[model samples]
Target: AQSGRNVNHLVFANTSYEILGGGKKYNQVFMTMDGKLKIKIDYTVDDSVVEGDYFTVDFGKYIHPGTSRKPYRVNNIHDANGRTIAIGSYDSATNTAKYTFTNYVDIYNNVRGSFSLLSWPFKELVTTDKQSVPVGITVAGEDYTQNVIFNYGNRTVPVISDINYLTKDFAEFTTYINQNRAFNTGSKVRLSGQGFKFTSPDEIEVYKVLNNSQFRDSFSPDYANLTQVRNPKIIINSDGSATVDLGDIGTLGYIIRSKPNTLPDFSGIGVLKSEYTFTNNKNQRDTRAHASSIQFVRAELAGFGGFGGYVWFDAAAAGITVNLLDPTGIRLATTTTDITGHYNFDNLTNGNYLVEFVMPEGYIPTVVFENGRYIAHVTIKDMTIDAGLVSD
Candidate 1:
């Protein structure tokens, strides 16, 4: 039986490592968790000498599938290419990886400086170590090639581009994620695109990879827990979208659902609410103007008694009446915003409702709830009530 906590390791065939340094040395080696993974390598070198030379270590992998051809074949998985690792030598005295250049090979160190360890498609990881050299080498027998670096430097794991959101710069995408998400083992998140506001699933793909497994856009039952999620508390309107809410985000450092630089920002639960307001131009003095209609958005307004939340009306008008309308503009009940801007519409069923503003003296009455631009048309969305009246 496979233990849930057990971790598996994958190995490559005909394995080789890369060495790197600048100007003249070959001193570090590299590898990946499996074949498909890539990591950055940086270290310190002699300040007086250029030691950022780079090289590659190419072992080998089993091409055939299903037969368990190689230990690192990444059985039945397409993410096999992601397995990789990187290793470098450090100065034992300084307790870090650093090396000196011994032999200066001509072909490896061309004056044109056009040569590199990995081929064009084998992407290079970004780093800041100045004294590093990458040397390119081909496997003696097979068509494989590996590169490695030899020096004392620092390594920054590169953020996978496909997993990251799209932005002219990384700062925007990362900032949004950092400010909003609180991720966990099984947390799901949803993200939207810019300019084009279509809410179709076809445009997006979500998935997760185990700590030692490869990540893919495709779905797998084992890793199905990680997927795009929606906020359950706030109902999304037909035309308007709601962002994932991170409820009660009191003092957490940072959180996000998606990988950095990716297209959409993912969010988790806690405190999420629509940005909205309610009021009427008829009476600036009406207390209802300050009361948010949302407080009663979900309450039923029937029983001639009363409902929660404040309702505003024109103080200057005589016998003011407030009406509850459906998204399609059907009147359900009538009430009046009180002196304190409070109104009551009770004894109704539970569902969505739209509070319409009746015409007051001296001005054409508009909807009392002034939901912002995105929600101005709240009538046609979730708030569109389908039930009957509250009072006679």
Candidate 2:
């Protein structure tokens, strides 16, 4: 008698639909064959009003150790503070990645709900819709040939249909010249390609952004770092394409945004790149002013760079005097180290310079990498001079 085994039934909690934007929403959790899980929830949004607003379905309860002594997880296992109907996960069994979720949310009002995931941190791209995937249940020393299915009454959903990438190359500014008299090549790069998904936008907005340390010095998320470009207008074509002459851009970079009707002000749908060049410096001299000297002027521009690093001994590594000598060996700037053993001099004219590390109480220098003891034109690259100290 009783020779048949039973397949355990998996249940979902909070299957009742809830209110959202005058409509209602709900989630369904299920398991698939070959080890996988998914949770799809409904969201309100059109393709135009939804983007980058990441949506994430979070599992309420997490189960690691199960009765059969193996890793097990379920989405609706617990809500409020635990459990969710929409389910998915990165199962540790069979060592496979078989979980996903649906991403849909109300982004027309200019914000995504806190319940959404796969946005931001994980940068789960935003679109109009969604996932709560993978509830791994590895039947260790057991059997099952069917993909587990869950339901409000029974069910399915589509995942990743909304995720998107900006293939059209949003606007950006880079390596522009500031009208320098030295090189006399007043120049700046142009930017274009604003719309996404092959749909042309009515207009594109250009934003002025910080390019150098000033961006880091007074950075603000309150949109302080982003300013709408003025003077030069950004007019879009009817064919979904536009261009901006960054020659008017003061910062090293600019952000181009798509005007989708909703939301207020500058910033969005663009790109970023730092560093502006002195577009004026076109002439290069091999050395020592190929001619004569002794005169000073202010009509030309000067590019700057410098170097710094540790100056220390195994003991009493503090207060070391360091000097930056010009290529011909002349002291340019002298700096003292903190009690922690280091020195730095930045914003110096971009040229060859020697680092003079003064070691008191009998100590020498140590290093590697050819051109080992000096610094060259520093453009985003610097030296980590490890001044080693040995015996007297």
Candidate 3:
């Protein structure tokens, strides 16, 4: 994003929450990685930052390995060229690192009219291991401390294996967790090689994280966001492996509306979460009790698709019997057309389906369909069919 280590991207820089479906709550601010997790700032039309502006990140609040070098600088957010635009220093008394601006830059990475935020390096910390640190930014004398999950994960965990079963028959890109890829929705996923300790199946539970996990796969990490929304129960197989799946999760990454009054268009935001019992501090849980990062994204295609359309009178003309049949011609569901001659068949896997339409007693098959049947090929994007009817 600086460090080459894989860091968690589901974590966001939450100044507050406002986004999900009645909508889901989310922090509009985003976090990125290179060497350290950088908390992003909001967009500003002008140079709201000045030379005296500083940032404070408290490493003492989170679980971390002691750093060899405590008093270090480089707190300023870097530009696209990796220049030292904002020079900073550390204050040991408050246990906080302060980054002061050197040359104020109004734009970062060519994001027009956007102020250069905390895209800087965190070389101040000795270790690149996972840490959930807090950052306080002071600009124009107004202190802003985003009370949200702003951290990074740069450690190794159980590796995901078996691409055929994990993804939608796609290539297994990497043998690690939170890769720049996604798994098939509701497909069997497995992790092998140096498995986490869990004596029984009940000890492991898969959690579907609900947080500000960004959609850009290559730019974010796929670890657990740590809210711990448990849904699917994973099984630790007899072969000393853990096999899992997220049956019917609609989608992983979603758009957020940071504020209630915020309009429909704007904002940004997988990784699933899993926990296992272990020993020797062995549970090895993260700060939020997430023992291991168990996650899969609902991308890469092929999932619950739908079918629908309208029937013209010559339709339900007003009332018609619609049937959804399996590939073998066996009816799966039956329904009556609405007053407007609209019918839909959804929540089914993307595949071949036979849609049969039966008109009212006075109506017979129309020229459009000799037998009033249509073959629908479902996909992520639903398909629509229109049928015509004539009087008997």
Candidate 4:
């Protein structure tokens, strides 16, 4: 066909391809332009329909005078859903036309399934055509529709949770006992992270568990508390595990969480979270508190009539050497009495210990027994032994 006023010859083109699905054959047809002249149109379909695959669908030249040549641009390329499914270009100087599509498999249109949407919240409409973004997927495979509102706006983005990135052991508790009685004081507790590493700007959160509490309050109830611990110096170890410069805690339980920044409220986007509880029978403390058993000894001079204390003149024994031995007479620790007749042995482990006080010159040693044995059996508690001296 010849156009008397128009130079561009091609006016309309219709193309079709056969596809097999559901045990049936169907023709997928695409119609373009409008009736004006005769031009051949054909297309090839790829074997796979996944994203990144592409197929070419058009070309040719038959000029009609008096009309300007309009080359096909990519923005005009669209699918039935009105999305910019493919991009195209046509060159007049070279008289060439090429087109490539992002593939129809990239499209999302399932009714009852869950999938990850990477580039969500589509921006800038390419075509006026609108499609529904599926939400609230079902497990039983049924059809449903619902409206969703987007609240994305101007605001400082919150940090993501990194709890899983940091790791640590479960709760550990301890106590002390001696002579069949629990110690009134001195129990050390600790929690450590082994085989863990963190980059800069990372934070670790620790919470002390109160009586009858299951988990950390802030991370639950929809991020109401959002409480956290700031930057902490976590000391690394040579054995692959790690420990932090944490202070000693007297309580029996605690909660721990780690993140990159201020823990985000509600949930983390592509981030990880971790929670743990520590519990045991032992009372826990840090290095700041006593690490071993403590025992005190004192040597006092006998008063006038065996009623100790100062009826005439009261005084404390000084420069007296005391020996601490285990049950088999093996020396464990040693200390000297001070001017106030007081001596102490610390950092001792659990065992039966014998306290031997060296008698001073011109003084006789007075020994007494509370239990049948002279050796003090130290379990976890501290003990005080009295060694009396009398002028001979």
Q: Evaluated with lDDT, which candidate comes out highest?
A: 3
Higher-ranked by lDDT: 3 or 4 = 3
Encode model 2's per-residue lDDT on 1-392: one tens digit a residue: 31111111111111111212111223322111111122223232223322122222232222121111112322211123332212233344432221111212121232111122111111111101123323332231122122222221111110001111121122111122221112322223222222221133234444554532212110111234567666544434364333335552322443443322211222343222222222333333211100100111111112234566775564545777766654433444567887777778885443355666666654445422232232333222215554666655
Compose the digit string of candidate 3's lDDT tens values, residues 1-392: 31111111211122322211111122322222212224334432124443334444343433121111112223334444544333334454554544444333323332212122222223333123222334444433244553333223333232221111122222121222222223223334444322122244453334343543422222123334433434555566675455555343333422110000111222221112222121212233222112222123232123447878888876245567777654444444567778888989775544466677875556565413445354443333426877776766
Single out the weakest 10-residue window by summed lDDT for candidate 3.
254-263
User: lDDT, candidate 1, residue 152?
Assistant: 19
Q: After the best TM-score superposition of candidate 2, give how far the Cα of residue 74 lies from its true spot, in angstroms.
A: 66
For model 1, how big is the CA root-mean-square deviation? Answer: 31.7
- Judged by whole-model lDDT over C-alpha atoms, candidate 2 comes out at 0.30
For model 3, the local distance difference test gives 0.36
- The C-alpha TM-scores of every prediction are 0.19, 0.25, 0.26, 0.22
Which RMSD does model 3 reach against the true structure? Answer: 23.4
Question: At residue 339, what lDDT does model 1 achieve?
Answer: 66
Instruction: Quantify all predictions' global Cα lDDT against the true fold.
Output: 0.25, 0.30, 0.36, 0.29
Candidate 2 segments whose C-alpha is farther than 4 A from its true place: 1-304, 367-382
Better of 2 and 3 by TM-score: 3
| Candidate 1 structure quality by residue, lDDT tens digits, 59-145 | 222111111011111110001132111112222232222111211211122211111122111112312223233433222122443
Model 4 per-residue lDDT tens digits across residues 67-118: 1111112222343344433333334454333333333323433201111111
